[PDB]
Amino acid sequence: LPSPILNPDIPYNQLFINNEWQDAVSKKTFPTVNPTTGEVIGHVAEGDRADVDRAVKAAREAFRLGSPWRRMDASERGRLLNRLADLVERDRVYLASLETLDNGKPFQESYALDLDEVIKVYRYFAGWADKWHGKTIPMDGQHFCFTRHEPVGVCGQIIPWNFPLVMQGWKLAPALATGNTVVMKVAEQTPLSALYLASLIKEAGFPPGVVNIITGYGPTAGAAIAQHMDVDKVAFTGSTEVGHLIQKAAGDSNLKRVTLELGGKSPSIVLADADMEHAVEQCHEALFFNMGQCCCAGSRTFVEESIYNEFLERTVEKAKQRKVGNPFELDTQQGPQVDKEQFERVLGYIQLGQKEGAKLLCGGERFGERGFFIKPTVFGGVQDDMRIAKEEIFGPVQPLFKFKKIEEVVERANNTRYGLAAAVFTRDLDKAMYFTQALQAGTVWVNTYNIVTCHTPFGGFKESGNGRELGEDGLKAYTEVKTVTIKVPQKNS
Amino acid sequence: LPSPILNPDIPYNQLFINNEWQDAVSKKTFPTVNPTTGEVIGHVAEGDRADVDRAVKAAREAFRLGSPWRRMDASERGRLLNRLADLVERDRVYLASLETLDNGKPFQESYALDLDEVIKVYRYFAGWADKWHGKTIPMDGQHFCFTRHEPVGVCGQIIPWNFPLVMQGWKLAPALATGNTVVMKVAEQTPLSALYLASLIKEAGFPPGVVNIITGYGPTAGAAIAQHMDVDKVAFTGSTEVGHLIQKAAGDSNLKRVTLELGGKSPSIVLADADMEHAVEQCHEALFFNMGQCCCAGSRTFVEESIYNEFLERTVEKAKQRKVGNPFELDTQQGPQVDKEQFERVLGYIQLGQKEGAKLLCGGERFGERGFFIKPTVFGGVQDDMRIAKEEIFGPVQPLFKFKKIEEVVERANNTRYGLAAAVFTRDLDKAMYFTQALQAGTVWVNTYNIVTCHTPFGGFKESGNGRELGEDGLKAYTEVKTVTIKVPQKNS
Ligand SMILES: NC(=O)c1ccc[n+]([C@@H]2O[C@H](COP(=O)([O-])OP(=O)(O)OC[C@H]3O[C@@H](n4cnc5c(N)ncnc54)[C@H](O)[C@@H]3O)[C@@H](O)[C@H]2O)c1
Ligand SMILES: NC(=O)c1ccc[n+]([C@@H]2O[C@H](COP(=O)([O-])OP(=O)(O)OC[C@H]3O[C@@H](n4cnc5c(N)ncnc54)[C@H](O)[C@@H]3O)[C@@H](O)[C@H]2O)c1
Ligand SMILES: COc1ccccc1-n1cc(-c2ccc(-c3ccccc3)cc2)[n+]2c1CCCCC2
Ligand SMILES: COc1ccccc1-n1cc(-c2ccc(-c3ccccc3)cc2)[n+]2c1CCCCC2
Ligand code: NA
Ligand code: NA
């Protein structure tokens, strides 16, 4: 609704360590690109292992028994996160503009959805800080037994490019609320918004070293965090393939605690009794939201046989109508893909789908001449043995499948290494209930899609992840439990 | 205290798979020794990778949607676990006699402590089965949101030899309470008691495939479970060294969920205002319990300067008084070490302690000339840089340490990669409270030691583990959370 800042000042482009801005040890930089124009926005510090070492020492000292951050009331940690959120709300237009600049997402998305969720996640976990309780336990013998929920310690946090500020907030908010310290590695494709957010962390009054932000490449700066002997926990959001490596690196270094939020090939399932127009609209947005670059995208749309043709025609019409263009104009629905490599990878899958025997119904090529835009693409007659049915495309390509039986579609839905999310559309109580049990996914939506808020635990079954983020259940990965058992003179109930 | 059975019949010595007794595919068998005499009791099946695949297959079928185990009331899982407890109680003397035969622990411990704990853990988790609740969540928008606590699936469980029945129960009870199926790999040194327990699992009425027991080696049968692509979760108890390999294997295979319960070098810390006789006795048992073969053994005794000489002298006398001998004798306090390799490892550490300049105060050699018996051994003047101060001896060797300040002893206690347990002995409220905060351990005892029951969460900080077993908190490792979010017509509070 408000007006975007079309080319803003970008003062922050260095490492954030110990509440100060600094270059890498090596003084090296790397470019970030504006994906709409294909042009370089500017350069950013290229952090590597030595820079990580500096951030870890800073985080380690901020966490020391008797430190400000350790001594401080849990409620003061809350007040800080709440003030941080106030500051995000003050700078909301700038941040949303910066996000659209660097990532490519439509400013209507950045402003109204992403920034809304950033603010809410910081405010939500602000409230948890002083409400996270251990237990008193009526154990056998002359004993008083309780648990303390202590912080896990120095948390390495590695995030992707598709929702730079949201992903940052999902990591930082619960970690800080439970009194941890942080070394965060943001994505090479989208470093800018996270650095401005770091400036607001300092402004909010977080002590030095509580949050440290590192820009750099995955195999260098990322890997240094996952392998570090003085990092107590790693929380990784990214690809399933890198997920495997993170877990191995934990096993290979110091048995750091691991949470993994990985890839998806999530199914939308539309039954015959569904509200047709609603299901078509929901499945359409389930795929094309954020240009198909959403980890829980409805990337397989399964449709009952008796409504398939109608559903298909209406789906193609919505794909053809979706406005592709400059994301700074307010009615733009689909911006560009994030970079050249993603661009080419999505076009590669479009070709592959054609070669495999799937029917290209619309789009299927580049939109325009400048930047990394792709026309909304829909495939029909897709088979489970096709590669476009199996691999995570991560772009604006919607494959359609046909099924006949309830039991058939659950098996097909579940026949994947992935298990991040799923959805059913139906009017029937009994079928909705069956699907909520039968679908092997961390989140099951009924008659909706992509409703992930600060309250809703989120993560994968199978190779889509290990552990959950968000909600109360999301606090548990940032907590180390201590049992205290004390001999007492006598015991009464 | 009842009479042990000295010559029990041992009918069960095969793999337990799909409620059927089976040979290994290879027909290979391996011997288990009676550590009291050093003689072979008999042979058991040498399960390998092919046998694990067979067990995992049976567990998977038992876990399938619509199987007896999946559709059973949670309360019926409870009744099954309760019935198992009744059968253990019925066969308590037999089970405890077999434990002593195979492992070497005194029958006084076996009957009155171990078997007690086994019965309790099954009964405890029997009660959790129908009381493990998810949540309803007052989420934003026109939504009904809740969580299902689903079983994680096929759980690979690998246990050590030091408490064979208890370690089995700690694994099986929470896993079964929460609706999982199991493939368990028991320790090569102590296969027998776990197989008799499996026959009780069958008698109690658990469906085929819900519990599967594999006997065999670590790098074959155990490795096969940890690397298996159809195992959803691995819960491992054992050395820290092998723990690193389990976490790597999970990351190298299918991102199976991991819990690790690993080694320790736990400190008991005696302040000058402690009750002397009590602290001496408690620290003595804290090390010598189960022939020093306890993960959370008080294996570094720190004593304040002003009471050290007296403490030392009383500790020596107590070591010299401990009855070493045949574990079937009701007053034996110390049986043999578990096998030749463990026996020689402990003597090697005794030799090493004296080379490093530690002072041998008593014991320090073999007890007699048959079986694997070692004289209770105490070292004085031990320094933090000695190998016997840093490494897990896992035998009846008690090193004593001198300190002067609280801030000193906290640093020295905490300066290890281990973190399973710790204890403080004091009369002073403020000092007890301070140590419960400052010690980096999963369990902190105050004026007691080794009080780990079905109620009390247990596990390591740092390299002593990942996650917690027992209590309510121990259910979490066996639970996969599913968030269900449903569009509703209107929302009211
Ligand atoms: N489940 C979720 O919450 C969630 C959310 C958003 C995105 N994703 C997933 O993220 C993926 C897309 O993002 P991506 O391409 O940036 O994936 P990625 O695995 O290539 O990179 C993710 C992050 O890890 C870093 N990285 C890369 N290699 C590394 C290594 N060897 N060691 C340590 N760090 C390394 C990158 O620099 C980046 O910061 C998709 O598969 C998507 O499904 C998941
Ligand atoms: N934290 C706890 O609850 C707890 C309780 C009891 C014992 N322990 C620890 O257990 C250790 C002693 O037991 P242990 O000597 O039998 O240790 P271990 O690590 O050598 O073996 C433990 C189990 O794992 C298997 N194993 C061995 N190598 C393996 C491999 N490479 N892959 C898969 N499985 C493998 C063994 O056959 C056995 O069943 C000590 O360090 C002790 O502290 C911990
Ligand atoms: C920042 O957002 C996300 C980040 C990650 C994952 C998912 C989301 N995501 C995606 C969507 C979302 C829902 C519905 C539509 C839509 C629009 C028109 C017609 C029909 C449906 C578009 C987007 N939302 C969210 C956040 C949570 C609730 C608010 C809405
Ligand atoms: C099966 O046992 C265990 C298994 C694993 C870990 C610890 C134990 N463990 C060890 C002990 C234990 C406590 C106190 C003494 C003692 C005796 C004489 C004088 C002073 C103290 C001996 C043993 N207990 C337990 C379990 C139940 C709690 C109470 C009993
Ligand atoms: Na960019
Ligand atoms: Na034996």
PDB file of C-alpha atoms in Angstrom, chain B residues 4-195:
ATOM      1  CA  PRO B   4      19.950 -66.700  43.222  1.00  0.00           C
ATOM      2  CA  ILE B   5      19.581 -69.422  40.618  1.00  0.00           C
ATOM      3  CA  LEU B   6      23.225 -70.490  40.093  1.00  0.00           C
ATOM      4  CA  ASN B   7      22.720 -72.718  37.041  1.00  0.00           C
ATOM      5  CA  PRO B   8      19.823 -71.222  35.089  1.00  0.00           C
ATOM      6  CA  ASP B   9      18.533 -72.825  31.903  1.00  0.00           C
ATOM      7  CA  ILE B  10      19.235 -70.447  29.014  1.00  0.00           C
ATOM      8  CA  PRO B  11      16.709 -71.432  26.294  1.00  0.00           C
ATOM      9  CA  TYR B  12      16.968 -68.211  24.256  1.00  0.00           C
ATOM     10  CA  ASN B  13      20.123 -67.554  22.188  1.00  0.00           C
ATOM     11  CA  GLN B  14      18.897 -66.583  18.700  1.00  0.00           C
ATOM     12  CA  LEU B  15      17.784 -63.407  16.921  1.00  0.00           C
ATOM     13  CA  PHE B  16      14.307 -62.116  17.824  1.00  0.00           C
ATOM     14  CA  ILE B  17      12.589 -60.917  14.646  1.00  0.00           C
ATOM     15  CA  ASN B  18       8.878 -60.731  13.958  1.00  0.00           C
ATOM     16  CA  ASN B  19       8.202 -62.537  17.272  1.00  0.00           C
ATOM     17  CA  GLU B  20      10.178 -65.531  15.923  1.00  0.00           C
ATOM     18  CA  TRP B  21      13.501 -66.956  17.087  1.00  0.00           C
ATOM     19  CA  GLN B  22      15.947 -67.056  14.164  1.00  0.00           C
ATOM     20  CA  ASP B  23      19.524 -67.888  13.309  1.00  0.00           C
ATOM     21  CA  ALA B  24      21.671 -65.294  11.563  1.00  0.00           C
ATOM     22  CA  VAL B  25      21.469 -65.699   7.760  1.00  0.00           C
ATOM     23  CA  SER B  26      25.168 -66.728   7.819  1.00  0.00           C
ATOM     24  CA  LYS B  27      24.533 -69.273  10.639  1.00  0.00           C
ATOM     25  CA  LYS B  28      27.503 -67.711  12.471  1.00  0.00           C
ATOM     26  CA  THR B  29      27.424 -67.624  16.271  1.00  0.00           C
ATOM     27  CA  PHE B  30      29.726 -66.025  18.850  1.00  0.00           C
ATOM     28  CA  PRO B  31      30.560 -66.821  22.482  1.00  0.00           C
ATOM     29  CA  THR B  32      29.643 -64.939  25.669  1.00  0.00           C
ATOM     30  CA  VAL B  33      31.800 -65.378  28.758  1.00  0.00           C
ATOM     31  CA  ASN B  34      31.006 -65.581  32.455  1.00  0.00           C
ATOM     32  CA  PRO B  35      33.417 -62.928  33.790  1.00  0.00           C
ATOM     33  CA  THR B  36      33.523 -64.552  37.275  1.00  0.00           C
ATOM     34  CA  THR B  37      35.164 -67.741  35.951  1.00  0.00           C
ATOM     35  CA  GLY B  38      36.334 -66.609  32.521  1.00  0.00           C
ATOM     36  CA  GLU B  39      34.520 -69.559  30.896  1.00  0.00           C
ATOM     37  CA  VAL B  40      32.122 -69.576  27.941  1.00  0.00           C
ATOM     38  CA  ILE B  41      28.473 -69.748  29.064  1.00  0.00           C
ATOM     39  CA  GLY B  42      27.322 -70.465  25.490  1.00  0.00           C
ATOM     40  CA  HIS B  43      26.876 -69.088  21.982  1.00  0.00           C
ATOM     41  CA  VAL B  44      24.411 -66.666  20.399  1.00  0.00           C
ATOM     42  CA  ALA B  45      23.584 -65.712  16.840  1.00  0.00           C
ATOM     43  CA  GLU B  46      26.027 -63.313  15.163  1.00  0.00           C
ATOM     44  CA  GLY B  47      23.623 -60.948  13.445  1.00  0.00           C
ATOM     45  CA  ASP B  48      25.036 -58.814  10.672  1.00  0.00           C
ATOM     46  CA  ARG B  49      23.726 -56.382   8.005  1.00  0.00           C
ATOM     47  CA  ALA B  50      21.399 -58.932   6.351  1.00  0.00           C
ATOM     48  CA  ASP B  51      19.754 -59.682   9.686  1.00  0.00           C
ATOM     49  CA  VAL B  52      19.296 -55.990  10.512  1.00  0.00           C
ATOM     50  CA  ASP B  53      17.571 -55.531   7.095  1.00  0.00           C
ATOM     51  CA  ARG B  54      15.238 -58.367   8.041  1.00  0.00           C
ATOM     52  CA  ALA B  55      14.445 -56.787  11.445  1.00  0.00           C
ATOM     53  CA  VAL B  56      13.958 -53.299   9.975  1.00  0.00           C
ATOM     54  CA  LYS B  57      11.588 -54.856   7.415  1.00  0.00           C
ATOM     55  CA  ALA B  58       9.556 -56.418  10.196  1.00  0.00           C
ATOM     56  CA  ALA B  59       9.544 -53.133  12.197  1.00  0.00           C
ATOM     57  CA  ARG B  60       8.444 -51.226   9.091  1.00  0.00           C
ATOM     58  CA  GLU B  61       5.499 -53.554   8.403  1.00  0.00           C
ATOM     59  CA  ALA B  62       4.471 -53.296  12.064  1.00  0.00           C
ATOM     60  CA  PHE B  63       4.566 -49.503  11.728  1.00  0.00           C
ATOM     61  CA  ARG B  64       2.391 -49.330   8.548  1.00  0.00           C
ATOM     62  CA  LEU B  65      -0.829 -47.233   8.523  1.00  0.00           C
ATOM     63  CA  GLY B  66      -3.685 -49.516   9.641  1.00  0.00           C
ATOM     64  CA  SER B  67      -1.474 -52.146  11.370  1.00  0.00           C
ATOM     65  CA  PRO B  68      -2.522 -53.523  14.799  1.00  0.00           C
ATOM     66  CA  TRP B  69       0.159 -51.326  16.494  1.00  0.00           C
ATOM     67  CA  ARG B  70      -0.841 -48.071  14.756  1.00  0.00           C
ATOM     68  CA  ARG B  71      -4.561 -48.375  15.377  1.00  0.00           C
ATOM     69  CA  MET B  72      -4.452 -49.786  18.900  1.00  0.00           C
ATOM     70  CA  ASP B  73      -5.602 -47.356  21.634  1.00  0.00           C
ATOM     71  CA  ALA B  74      -2.638 -45.563  23.220  1.00  0.00           C
ATOM     72  CA  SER B  75      -3.992 -46.926  26.535  1.00  0.00           C
ATOM     73  CA  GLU B  76      -3.588 -50.485  25.171  1.00  0.00           C
ATOM     74  CA  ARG B  77       0.106 -49.821  24.474  1.00  0.00           C
ATOM     75  CA  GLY B  78       0.163 -48.815  28.140  1.00  0.00           C
ATOM     76  CA  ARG B  79      -1.514 -52.052  29.242  1.00  0.00           C
ATOM     77  CA  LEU B  80       0.987 -54.035  27.200  1.00  0.00           C
ATOM     78  CA  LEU B  81       3.914 -52.269  28.933  1.00  0.00           C
ATOM     79  CA  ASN B  82       2.304 -52.835  32.321  1.00  0.00           C
ATOM     80  CA  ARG B  83       1.844 -56.527  31.539  1.00  0.00           C
ATOM     81  CA  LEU B  84       5.503 -56.715  30.541  1.00  0.00           C
ATOM     82  CA  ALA B  85       6.397 -55.224  33.960  1.00  0.00           C
ATOM     83  CA  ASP B  86       4.287 -57.904  35.676  1.00  0.00           C
ATOM     84  CA  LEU B  87       6.150 -60.634  33.777  1.00  0.00           C
ATOM     85  CA  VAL B  88       9.551 -59.124  34.717  1.00  0.00           C
ATOM     86  CA  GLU B  89       8.381 -59.037  38.335  1.00  0.00           C
ATOM     87  CA  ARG B  90       7.258 -62.692  38.054  1.00  0.00           C
ATOM     88  CA  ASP B  91      10.679 -63.752  36.645  1.00  0.00           C
ATOM     89  CA  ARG B  92      12.745 -61.313  38.730  1.00  0.00           C
ATOM     90  CA  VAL B  93      15.045 -63.845  40.370  1.00  0.00           C
ATOM     91  CA  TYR B  94      15.735 -65.563  37.070  1.00  0.00           C
ATOM     92  CA  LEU B  95      16.386 -62.282  35.251  1.00  0.00           C
ATOM     93  CA  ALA B  96      18.689 -60.976  37.991  1.00  0.00           C
ATOM     94  CA  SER B  97      20.541 -64.320  38.165  1.00  0.00           C
ATOM     95  CA  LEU B  98      21.115 -64.274  34.391  1.00  0.00           C
ATOM     96  CA  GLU B  99      22.241 -60.638  34.530  1.00  0.00           C
ATOM     97  CA  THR B 100      24.843 -61.548  37.182  1.00  0.00           C
ATOM     98  CA  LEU B 101      26.019 -64.620  35.273  1.00  0.00           C
ATOM     99  CA  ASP B 102      26.604 -62.716  32.020  1.00  0.00           C
ATOM    100  CA  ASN B 103      27.708 -59.260  33.215  1.00  0.00           C
ATOM    101  CA  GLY B 104      29.317 -60.000  36.595  1.00  0.00           C
ATOM    102  CA  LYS B 105      27.436 -57.480  38.764  1.00  0.00           C
ATOM    103  CA  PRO B 106      26.656 -58.580  42.343  1.00  0.00           C
ATOM    104  CA  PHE B 107      23.281 -60.328  42.690  1.00  0.00           C
ATOM    105  CA  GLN B 108      22.517 -57.845  45.480  1.00  0.00           C
ATOM    106  CA  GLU B 109      22.709 -55.055  42.806  1.00  0.00           C
ATOM    107  CA  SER B 110      21.031 -57.157  40.061  1.00  0.00           C
ATOM    108  CA  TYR B 111      18.008 -58.141  42.121  1.00  0.00           C
ATOM    109  CA  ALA B 112      17.452 -55.124  44.332  1.00  0.00           C
ATOM    110  CA  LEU B 113      18.606 -52.227  42.111  1.00  0.00           C
ATOM    111  CA  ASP B 114      18.715 -53.109  38.377  1.00  0.00           C
ATOM    112  CA  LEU B 115      15.573 -55.282  38.285  1.00  0.00           C
ATOM    113  CA  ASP B 116      13.788 -52.769  40.507  1.00  0.00           C
ATOM    114  CA  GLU B 117      14.596 -50.007  37.980  1.00  0.00           C
ATOM    115  CA  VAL B 118      13.551 -52.223  34.984  1.00  0.00           C
ATOM    116  CA  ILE B 119      10.129 -52.874  36.511  1.00  0.00           C
ATOM    117  CA  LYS B 120       9.709 -49.211  37.392  1.00  0.00           C
ATOM    118  CA  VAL B 121      10.652 -47.885  33.949  1.00  0.00           C
ATOM    119  CA  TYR B 122       8.207 -50.137  32.128  1.00  0.00           C
ATOM    120  CA  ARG B 123       5.424 -49.181  34.589  1.00  0.00           C
ATOM    121  CA  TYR B 124       6.345 -45.492  34.402  1.00  0.00           C
ATOM    122  CA  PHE B 125       6.159 -45.251  30.621  1.00  0.00           C
ATOM    123  CA  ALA B 126       3.072 -47.480  30.560  1.00  0.00           C
ATOM    124  CA  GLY B 127       1.392 -44.521  32.212  1.00  0.00           C
ATOM    125  CA  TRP B 128       2.649 -41.950  29.662  1.00  0.00           C
ATOM    126  CA  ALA B 129       1.168 -43.678  26.610  1.00  0.00           C
ATOM    127  CA  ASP B 130      -2.279 -42.059  26.910  1.00  0.00           C
ATOM    128  CA  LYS B 131      -1.152 -38.816  28.581  1.00  0.00           C
ATOM    129  CA  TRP B 132       1.231 -37.461  25.947  1.00  0.00           C
ATOM    130  CA  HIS B 133      -0.753 -34.532  24.554  1.00  0.00           C
ATOM    131  CA  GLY B 134      -0.300 -32.200  21.645  1.00  0.00           C
ATOM    132  CA  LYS B 135      -1.609 -28.633  21.517  1.00  0.00           C
ATOM    133  CA  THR B 136      -4.382 -26.431  20.196  1.00  0.00           C
ATOM    134  CA  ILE B 137      -2.923 -23.108  19.125  1.00  0.00           C
ATOM    135  CA  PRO B 138      -4.752 -19.655  19.024  1.00  0.00           C
ATOM    136  CA  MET B 139      -3.071 -18.736  15.774  1.00  0.00           C
ATOM    137  CA  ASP B 140      -3.750 -15.584  13.648  1.00  0.00           C
ATOM    138  CA  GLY B 141      -6.431 -15.665  10.908  1.00  0.00           C
ATOM    139  CA  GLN B 142      -9.555 -17.773  10.317  1.00  0.00           C
ATOM    140  CA  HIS B 143      -7.827 -21.025  11.321  1.00  0.00           C
ATOM    141  CA  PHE B 144      -8.027 -23.992  13.689  1.00  0.00           C
ATOM    142  CA  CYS B 145      -4.457 -25.117  14.431  1.00  0.00           C
ATOM    143  CA  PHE B 146      -3.295 -28.113  16.425  1.00  0.00           C
ATOM    144  CA  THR B 147      -0.362 -30.459  16.808  1.00  0.00           C
ATOM    145  CA  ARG B 148      -0.353 -34.214  16.639  1.00  0.00           C
ATOM    146  CA  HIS B 149       2.312 -36.077  18.591  1.00  0.00           C
ATOM    147  CA  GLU B 150       3.066 -38.869  16.127  1.00  0.00           C
ATOM    148  CA  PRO B 151       5.600 -41.662  16.651  1.00  0.00           C
ATOM    149  CA  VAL B 152       8.897 -41.004  14.897  1.00  0.00           C
ATOM    150  CA  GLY B 153       8.716 -44.499  13.248  1.00  0.00           C
ATOM    151  CA  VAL B 154      11.275 -47.312  13.102  1.00  0.00           C
ATOM    152  CA  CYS B 155      13.708 -46.652  15.925  1.00  0.00           C
ATOM    153  CA  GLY B 156      17.141 -48.185  15.879  1.00  0.00           C
ATOM    154  CA  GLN B 157      18.353 -48.630  19.448  1.00  0.00           C
ATOM    155  CA  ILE B 158      21.920 -49.507  20.407  1.00  0.00           C
ATOM    156  CA  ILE B 159      22.952 -50.140  24.019  1.00  0.00           C
ATOM    157  CA  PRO B 160      26.129 -50.946  26.048  1.00  0.00           C
ATOM    158  CA  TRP B 161      26.896 -53.825  28.453  1.00  0.00           C
ATOM    159  CA  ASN B 162      27.122 -52.146  31.845  1.00  0.00           C
ATOM    160  CA  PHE B 163      23.399 -52.280  32.745  1.00  0.00           C
ATOM    161  CA  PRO B 164      21.963 -54.588  30.087  1.00  0.00           C
ATOM    162  CA  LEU B 165      18.312 -54.841  31.270  1.00  0.00           C
ATOM    163  CA  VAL B 166      18.076 -51.298  32.555  1.00  0.00           C
ATOM    164  CA  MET B 167      19.549 -49.778  29.337  1.00  0.00           C
ATOM    165  CA  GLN B 168      17.145 -51.933  27.355  1.00  0.00           C
ATOM    166  CA  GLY B 169      14.159 -50.662  29.405  1.00  0.00           C
ATOM    167  CA  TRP B 170      15.229 -47.015  29.187  1.00  0.00           C
ATOM    168  CA  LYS B 171      15.113 -47.423  25.406  1.00  0.00           C
ATOM    169  CA  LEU B 172      12.143 -49.722  24.850  1.00  0.00           C
ATOM    170  CA  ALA B 173       9.712 -48.206  27.345  1.00  0.00           C
ATOM    171  CA  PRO B 174       9.449 -44.602  26.062  1.00  0.00           C
ATOM    172  CA  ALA B 175       9.697 -45.720  22.404  1.00  0.00           C
ATOM    173  CA  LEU B 176       6.821 -48.188  22.786  1.00  0.00           C
ATOM    174  CA  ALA B 177       4.746 -45.811  24.937  1.00  0.00           C
ATOM    175  CA  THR B 178       4.785 -43.309  22.038  1.00  0.00           C
ATOM    176  CA  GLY B 179       3.879 -45.920  19.384  1.00  0.00           C
ATOM    177  CA  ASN B 180       7.185 -46.614  17.642  1.00  0.00           C
ATOM    178  CA  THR B 181       8.621 -49.919  16.510  1.00  0.00           C
ATOM    179  CA  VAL B 182      12.108 -50.981  17.379  1.00  0.00           C
ATOM    180  CA  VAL B 183      15.181 -52.740  16.122  1.00  0.00           C
ATOM    181  CA  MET B 184      17.566 -53.079  19.071  1.00  0.00           C
ATOM    182  CA  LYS B 185      21.229 -54.032  19.009  1.00  0.00           C
ATOM    183  CA  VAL B 186      22.410 -55.284  22.370  1.00  0.00           C
ATOM    184  CA  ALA B 187      26.029 -55.407  23.479  1.00  0.00           C
ATOM    185  CA  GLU B 188      28.201 -58.399  22.418  1.00  0.00           C
ATOM    186  CA  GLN B 189      29.450 -58.819  26.002  1.00  0.00           C
ATOM    187  CA  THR B 190      25.924 -59.257  27.517  1.00  0.00           C
ATOM    188  CA  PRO B 191      23.419 -60.641  25.010  1.00  0.00           C
ATOM    189  CA  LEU B 192      21.481 -63.108  27.149  1.00  0.00           C
ATOM    190  CA  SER B 193      19.187 -61.208  29.538  1.00  0.00           C
ATOM    191  CA  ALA B 194      17.806 -59.083  26.697  1.00  0.00           C
ATOM    192  CA  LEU B 195      16.714 -62.207  24.774  1.00  0.00           C
TER     193      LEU B 195
END
